[PDB]
Design a protein around this ligand. Structure first.
Ligand code: LEU
Ligand code: NA
Ligand code: NA
Length: 502
């Protein structure tokens, strides 16, 4: 095989893959925790030396594998490098997107549930004291996802949240089951424009927010005012790189799978650059101009930063709607906010489930319908772990969405640009390109990028190896045990797929 119908649809599909919850939730938090402008320099650099090259690399690998009827890494890694271990490493191209999808889709169902409740107007009703304004919404969120009073391991999701999660899964399925061109592409051409429009509107509305405590203006200033005292802080660089990986959907095997449906002769250079650029625009210009400026507007910079450090969902699901509730038509404004998050998340969720679907179709020769339904079944079932187990979400997001993507990014780059050959890879990347990659990026891909990632991983491992063993909560061990099981499961499927070939 299936292919993208038009170039536009391809672009919007890829853009739909990248632009998501990571733009309007993760980014604002990351940028706020790291000192605003101080975070932007490493962010941009990371975008130039990591995001772009890896994006092109994944597009290339994707199309390359797609030409031979393989959209997933287990097979592609083998095409690029002949080895059993290459397939084993390729398993991550399925494990990562699957694990991430498990909790990602659940968070997506959250945005949907909130969108509905805010649309219908069922929300907490605040009365000049910040806590008296935020508390109702904190209780609102906690009641929705069933957060425990103290630090208790069990979550008690409301019936509504559960039902909404089912609906979300259904929507994802209804889109995925129609295929690449008919299902994903069609929806992209609608969801994306809608997304951009809503984002712009929100940006403007938020912009107009001004109080005795501050202005959205001050927030934007805080975000775009350079600070170089933080450039000696490794944590900032690590956070920047992590954000780049997450937002561009790098290391998730999603880009590759999407790229495998691009015709062998079609350009991946300009298309890839456009998709990445669109994402960054949606991230720094749109995402960073909504939450932070609003928080700063009402509570000021210091408090806004504190709120950001408080949590990832605290700014998006609590603070912002609480701020909106204090303005005329603030309930409807909250709805637009959660409808935006839902479309952004939906366009991404379908992208991280596709790798699994593509593997079942290509390697196990399953029909699209069956592949989708089973993928949905697996995700839905596994989701109960994230739904009822506290801290499970964070564990999955860490192992898969943080460490895994970087490790996998390094792995894929090493396999493609080193083992498979640098020149053959470069030639494969530039082939059919409407425009050609700057020569300098050849030396960036072959030397700079892998070294940077390697160093990053080394640093990470050092701090984490001791902490892992000494962790008190059982919920995390359960999660670890289960996801390890998923890995074995996928490895087994790859084994079967391998045997069927012979
Ligand atoms: C896992 C990825 C599909 C996440 C997506 N790139 C986002 O920014 O939300
Ligand atoms: Na998206
Ligand atoms: Na993104």
């Amino acid at each position: 095989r299936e292919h993208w119908a038009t170039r536009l649809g391809l672009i919007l599909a890829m853009a739909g893959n990248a632009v998501g919850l990571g733009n309007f939730l993760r980014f604002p938090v990351q940028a706020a925790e790291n000192g605003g402008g101080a975070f932007m320099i490493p962010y941009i650099i990371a975008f130039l030396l990591v995001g772009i090259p890896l994006m092109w690399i994944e597009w290339a690998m994707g199309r390359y594998g797609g030409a031979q009827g393989h959209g997933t890494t287990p097979a592609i890694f083998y095409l690029l490098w002949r080895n059993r271990f290459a397939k084993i490493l390729g398993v991550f191209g399925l494990w990562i997107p699957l694990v991430v999808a498990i909790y990602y889709v659940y968070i997506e169902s959250w945005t949907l549930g909130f969108a509905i409740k805010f649309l219908v107007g069922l929300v907490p009703e605040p009365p000049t004291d910040p806590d008296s304004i935020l508390r109702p919404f904190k209780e609102f969120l906690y009641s929705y996802i069933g957060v425990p009073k103290g630090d208790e391991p069990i979550l008690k999701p409301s019936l509504f949240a559960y039902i909404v999660f089912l609906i979300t899964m259904f929507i994802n399925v209804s889109i995925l089951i129609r295929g690449i061109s008919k299902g994903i592409e069609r929806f992209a051409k609608i969801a994306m424009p809608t997304l951009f429009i809503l984002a712009v509107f929100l940006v403007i509305r938020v912009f107009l927010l001004e109080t005795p405590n501050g202005t959205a203006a001050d927030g934007l200033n805080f975000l775009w005012t350079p600070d170089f005292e933080k450039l000696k802080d490794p944590g900032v660089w690590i956070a920047a790189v992590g954000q780049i990986f997450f937002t561009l959907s790098l290391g998730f095997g999603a880009i590759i799978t999407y790229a495998s449906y691009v015709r062998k002769d079609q350009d991946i250079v300009l298309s890839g650059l456009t998709a990445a650029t669109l994402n960054e625009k949606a991230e720094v210009i749109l995402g960073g101009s909504i939450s932070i400026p609003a928080a700063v507007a009402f509570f000021g910079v210091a408090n806004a930063v504190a709120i950001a450090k408080a949590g990832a969902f605290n700014l998006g699901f609590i603070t912002l709607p609480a701020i909106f509730s204090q303005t005329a038509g603030g309930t409807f404004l909250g709805f637009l906010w959660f409808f935006l998050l839902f479309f952004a998340g939906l366009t991404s969720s379908i992208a991280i489930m596709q790798p699994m679907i593509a593997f079942l179709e290509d390697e196990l020769k399953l029909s699209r319908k069956h592949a989708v339904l089973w993928t949905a079944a697996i995700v839905f079932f596994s989701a109960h772990l994230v739904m009822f187990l506290n801290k499970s979400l964070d564990e999955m997001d860490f192992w898969a969405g943080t460490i895994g993507v970087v490790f996998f990014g390094l792995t894929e780059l090493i396999i493609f640009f080193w083992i498979f050959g640098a020149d053959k890879a470069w030639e494969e990347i530039n082939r059919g390109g409407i425009i050609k990659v700057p020569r300098i990026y050849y030396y960036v891909m072959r030397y700079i990028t892998p070294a940077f990632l390697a160093v990053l991983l080394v640093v990470w491992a050092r701090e984490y190896i001791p902490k892992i063993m000494e962790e008190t909560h059982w919920t995390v061990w359960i999660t670890r045990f289960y996801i390890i099981g998923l890995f074995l499961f996928l490895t087994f499927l790859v084994f079967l797929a391998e045997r069927r070939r012979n």
